Amino acid sequence: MASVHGTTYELLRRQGIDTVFGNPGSNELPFLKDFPEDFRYILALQEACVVGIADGYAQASRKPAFINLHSAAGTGNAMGALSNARTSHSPLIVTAGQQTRAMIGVEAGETNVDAANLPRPLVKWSYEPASAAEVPHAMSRAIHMASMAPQGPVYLSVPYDDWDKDADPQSHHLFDRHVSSSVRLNDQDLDILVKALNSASNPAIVLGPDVDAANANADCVMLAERLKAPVWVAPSAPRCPFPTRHPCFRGLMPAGIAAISQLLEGHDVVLVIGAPVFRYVFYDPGQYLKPGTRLISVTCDPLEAARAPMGDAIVADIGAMASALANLVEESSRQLPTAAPEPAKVDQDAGRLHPETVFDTLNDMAPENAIYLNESTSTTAQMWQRLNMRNPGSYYFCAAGGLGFALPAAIGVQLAEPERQVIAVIGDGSANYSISALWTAAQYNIPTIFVIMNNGTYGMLRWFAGVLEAENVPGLDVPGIDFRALAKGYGVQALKADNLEQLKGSLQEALSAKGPVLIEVSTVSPV
Amino acid sequence: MASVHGTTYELLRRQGIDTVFGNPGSNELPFLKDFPEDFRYILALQEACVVGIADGYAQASRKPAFINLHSAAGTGNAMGALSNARTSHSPLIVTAGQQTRAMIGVEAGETNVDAANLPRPLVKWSYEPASAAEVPHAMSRAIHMASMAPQGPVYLSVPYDDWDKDADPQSHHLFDRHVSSSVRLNDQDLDILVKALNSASNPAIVLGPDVDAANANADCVMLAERLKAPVWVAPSAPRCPFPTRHPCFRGLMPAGIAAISQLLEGHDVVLVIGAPVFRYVFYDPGQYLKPGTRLISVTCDPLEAARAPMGDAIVADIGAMASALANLVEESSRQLPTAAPEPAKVDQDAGRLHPETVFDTLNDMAPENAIYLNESTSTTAQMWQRLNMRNPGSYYFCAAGGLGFALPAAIGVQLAEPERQVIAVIGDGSANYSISALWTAAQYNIPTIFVIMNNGTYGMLRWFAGVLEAENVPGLDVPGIDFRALAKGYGVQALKADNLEQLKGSLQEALSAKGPVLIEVSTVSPV
Ligand SMILES: Cc1ncc(C[n+]2csc(CCOP(=O)(O)OP(=O)(O)O)c2C)c(N)n1
Ligand SMILES: Cc1ncc(C[n+]2csc(CCOP(=O)(O)OP(=O)(O)O)c2C)c(N)n1
Ligand SMILES: [Mg+2]
Ligand SMILES: [Mg+2]
Ligand SMILES: [Mg+2]
């Protein structure tokens, strides 16, 4: 307890941390030594995997996740993953070991040069302490910065000789600090907003990932029912904020300016909750909103409020605001929206699987409290239409579009939610980015199901190339990957589905298995 | 070529670039479209692999390598690899596609936020142009910044709508620009240095990676022979700068302060060429130099000159300086140094392989012009003692200690040197970091030999834990990886060696094979 090591672990446990996601190195050994018995360590083989797992775990648990990486090389390997963490507002405490203070100036091997600048601009806060005794206070800042709205990844670099040094005896005041950002709009202005919602003749609601992060899903259901309002999920959705077969639900918005203003045409008040306004992707110029539509955004993120090209904004906690609004608005006497029609069953022969067939089969066979992850980039629209997701925390997709998220994140989610079957639907291209994460699932017996959609190509990129009139583009096809052999390589049970009969058979086997299972599915291909 | 696209490819070809190492994304399609017939594209499945391959290629070819990655996520995935590239002074031109200019402010999906700050502090230059017409001039800056001493990675972010825009007609002046940093110390001061070397009673030479980068190896042989001086390789060596069985050669320096000053005791003048002074790693306090020893460093890098804790320094081109010194110093009439003794042949039974046995066997069987890569971290000393490397460009080791270098870099080196057999000796832990690079070797039929040293553990970390008296450390063992299955997964021929007879058999097969080959070697293990 007298040491920085002892004091830091005490701070961590008192702040509710009990798991370390890591890949170790020399600079981290003085931190990891005498690893306390009330903590667990989750090893992954590459740092993109470490951070991916921790990210899934944080998102599903709705609590900060603690990460330990090796210096610049380890931090650097994780920076694509940190890109995703930024956009999903994932509360990640990223720590990295630094060389001993005496060896920094000469730039010894393993020195993290100008360390705090390395993860910038992706992190909320980034720091290397000026002394050993400062380390617990620096850790306190990291914990709270990650945890306060808008939540996000933070970075702390610690010289390895710091851990053995005497702690400041006054560091005890850090242990039980409670910091809240659970705030909502003042009574007067909240009343004005509620009045505007009550007065709307044709309101619409758009929900984003911070709704699911806040577990505000049920309150948003109540709000939608009271306002009798259609509900969309904001484009490029990292999470699912609403039951997908509720009568109000209208699906995933296309990531385009004109496309969204068209969907919102005729709606006089559009209430956006917990979403950027908006995560557009494709070139689709036009009006941000059509005449007669006003927009009000509730966001936990000042930068989201600042960068919205239209509408009013309120910067507040999504949980507190959704609860306030759901409980304050009048019950409208308008007709409840009609449920969206069932998607068509596509023609399926005895050959390669249409993605539509895969999602239909999953929906038929998976438990109702399944959790899905998506990194099958060309099939996102079909997935959203065909999976009935009733419960919160049921969907995750790389928040910044960074591939290599879903495979490790599915392992972290499954760890956070041992009673809910996790099924990751991942493209053949996407599977390779963080392929080594499979080993963590096998070693810790984390029973994630991985469904590899093998069409031999970067399907989404072919679609983008068509849109952009981009001809003669190299590097779009990925033939000759045996995913069963890869799963075997990392100790994961592997199955193949070349047709529907095999798909049903493989899913049946996977859903009854005691460990992780990979199913390679032969899907229809433009190759 | 009226477009930015046409002008930029013309600049690239006129500057000698003909290969693009990449993993494509949406923002890169307008750059990659109409890919010119005089260029080749080398696809890798993850960006650490892309950069690793390009790095190996650049180091072996002694020319800049051109890289194309996807936005923040792709750049981020490659940042551990950029750490290595920084320390090896690798001339890498890293380009990344950005969102269209119109969609940056709203932060559309695939936007690289504050892009130029992302790869900092790892790169020597980092930039996003303010207009489309500036792109060729920005590319020109990138090419020359990467190429001038001290060589290093650079970063350029380009909004994807820039490529179709009209180029500045004055961009033609960029095409044939020749920029030289091939400089040496002025005559007067060079004369003073030569006189100091001539006057030394007991000189020693220490060489670093910039010697091999400069192909200054032969000049350093001449210098060592003229001075009759023992030659060491500077600690944490990324490259081999000297024939390892030349009588002057004294091997790899231990990465410690006291250890190095002890080796240099009695030497009145120590000439360091092309190395930092020094890449110490382990805690080993003492004198930087013992009384009676003075040090003179020749470095291509101002930061290396600035941060040396001792000695005089000259900042100049390594090729020009080695050539000048080798040709100006008098031939000493001192006795030529005695060659280092043979390493002992360790006892080897019919069971698991001692690393010593592996290197002895490789040295017996590999061609004299083989190129070795090292990422078997616990066996580095044994490797240096047991492999006779006569030629330049014969050795590569992760410059910043960042794992995941050797496997992809071995593919790049083999591409650069099709007539020299590349053999990568990689630990079981290290193999996973960039495992997907194997696919590139299979798809382009790049006949690299991968030797996996499988001891089931992070061996070097166990050693570090003993030095630091770090007990109860989690995450040090990596059981249950089948490397043959992994190689099969990516289409690479796979062999196993459980004993010496099998090792000899597997190496014989690998050396006669037409494609890439992985050999999993069961090595001796502390568990
Ligand atoms: C780290 C990273 N690299 C590259 C990309 C660009 N990218 C976006 S979608 C895609 C295709 C993925 O292919 P696959 O997983 O097979 O799914 P499909 O598109 O075939 O459905 C690529 C390479 C990215 N978003 N992130
Ligand atoms: C990207 C990265 N992650 C982690 C480390 C820390 N590290 C250094 S050596 C090592 C062990 C590598 O094990 P292996 O490849 O099996 O070789 P061995 O030590 O067993 O010879 C690790 C994890 C690093 N240098 N870089
Ligand atoms: Mg695909
Ligand atoms: Mg940075
Ligand atoms: Mg090992």
Task: List its traits.
homodimer, alpha/beta, Rossmann fold, 3 domains, six-stranded parallel β-sheet, 18 strands, globular, binds magnesium ion, lyase, ThDP, Glycolaldehyde Synthase
Number of strands of chain A: 18
From the coordinates shown, what is the CATH architecture of the largest domain in chain A?
Answer: 3-Layer(aba) Sandwich
* Hetero groups: thiamine diphosphate, magnesium ion
- What is the overall shape of chain A? globular
Q: Strand arrangement, largest sheet of chain A?
A: 2-1-3-4-6-5
* CATH homologous superfamily identity of the largest domain in chain A: Thiamin diphosphate (ThDP)-binding fold, Pyr/PP domains
CATH class annotation of the largest domain in chain A: Alpha Beta
Number of domains of chain A: 3
PDB class: lyase
Keywords: ThDP, Glycolaldehyde Synthase, lyase
Assembly: dimeric
Entry title: structure of benzoylformate decarboxylases in complex with cofactor TPP
